[PDB]
Design goal:
monomer; 291 residues; mainly alpha; Peroxidase, domain 1; Peroxidase, domain 2; three-stranded antiparallel beta sheet; 46% helix; globular; binds protoporphyrin IX containing FE; transit peptide
């Protein structure tokens, strides 16, 4: 498969800036969701999950085709709870009917990070909605109960190296796990709708204890009321991962620069951009525009 980016016909920077302003104004407005966390966290989880299906070997999956709109991918167990991010974005898609799904799903992830005071993420337009038979089979997204060897190996399919995996996992500063969606329960930290290097500081500074939760799964619980998944705790058990965790715990700017590069790489995998395509867009936040 080749997937060539095609700009939505006749649209420029300013049209996409309005779709960004619309997602961001609705983030401000529906601030009550999930006990006042807001929709920001489930929108960057949605952007990672439609992108994390990519397979570098046959170029199938990933964000291009917008295939989460189809029932098979939508009812994948691994995607339980994402229906809330989809429901949020659907009024915005009725308002801007010209934007493709893959561009809407991935721009939601970019708007959420920058409006939660994260770094600027360069974004590119150009995904095209492809048919229901290009929709990937379930089982391409990662298990929760595993170790650092599984983590390295899984991310090799999307060809992320060690630094990119650790920068990307820092998004777990946001949101929380929910027992009814995944079988795990609890937040990774305290400021869970602000984007900081907190996930790394907690992994290193808390006194984690292994215990079973009410679903019968294991997780690392700390005295402060925080949790860590087996896959998150893996990052201080592996000597290569642990040096990068420490680097981000000591330097938030270095984490912001690396997360920014790795998150755009995640959202662009499997997509060929023609040299005539526009440069990546840097959107202004509500606040920078005075809105
Ligand atoms: C080995 C990799 C990963 C595993 C096993 C994993 C697993 C999970 C699980 C089990 C949840 C909670 C689901 C629920 O109960 O609602 C979750 C939530 C979340 N994940 Fe990860 N994750 C991984 C990677 C990532 C990456 C790379 C990103 C983003 C760049 C990400 C972003 C999020 C966010 C923001 C949430 C919070 C969602 C909410 O509050 O509803 N995850 N993840």
């Amino acid at each position: 498969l080749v997937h060539v980016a095609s700009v939505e016909k006749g649209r420029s920077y300013e049209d996409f800036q309005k779709v960004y302003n619309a997602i961001a104004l609705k983030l401000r407005e529906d601030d009550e969701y999930d006990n006042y966390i807001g929709y920001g966290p489930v929108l960057v989880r949605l952007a990672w999950h439609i992108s994390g299906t990519w397979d570098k070997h046959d170029n199938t999956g990933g964000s291009y085709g917008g295939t989460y709109r189809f029932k098979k991918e939508f009812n994948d167990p691994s995607n339980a709870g994402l229906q809330n991010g989809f429901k949020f974005l659907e009024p915005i898609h009725k308002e801007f009917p010209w934007i493709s799904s893959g561009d809407l799903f991935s721009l939601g992830g970019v708007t959420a990070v920058q409006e939660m005071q994260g770094p600027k993420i360069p974004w590119r337009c150009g995904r095209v909605d492809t048919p229901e038979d290009t929709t990937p089979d379930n089982g391409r997204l990662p298990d929760y109960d595993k170790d650092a060897g599984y983590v390295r190996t899984f991310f090799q399919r999307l060809n992320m190296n060690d630094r990119e995996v650790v920068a990307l996992m820092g998004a777990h500063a946001l949101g929380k796990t929910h027992l009814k969606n995944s079988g795990y329960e609890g937040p990774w930290g305290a400021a869970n709708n602000v984007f900081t290097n907190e996930f790394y500081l907690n992994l290193l500074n808390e006194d984690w204890k292994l215990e079973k939760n009410d679903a019968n799964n294991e997780q690392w619980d700390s005295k402060s009321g925080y949790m860590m998944l087996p896959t998150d705790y893996s990052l201080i058990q592996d000597p290569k991962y642990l040096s990068i965790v420490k680097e981000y715990a000591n330097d938030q700017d270095k984490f912001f620069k690396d997360f920014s590069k790795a998150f755009e790489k995640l959202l662009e995998n499997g997509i060929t951009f023609p040299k005539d395509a526009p440069s990546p867009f840097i959107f202004k936040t509500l606040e920078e525009q005075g809105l």
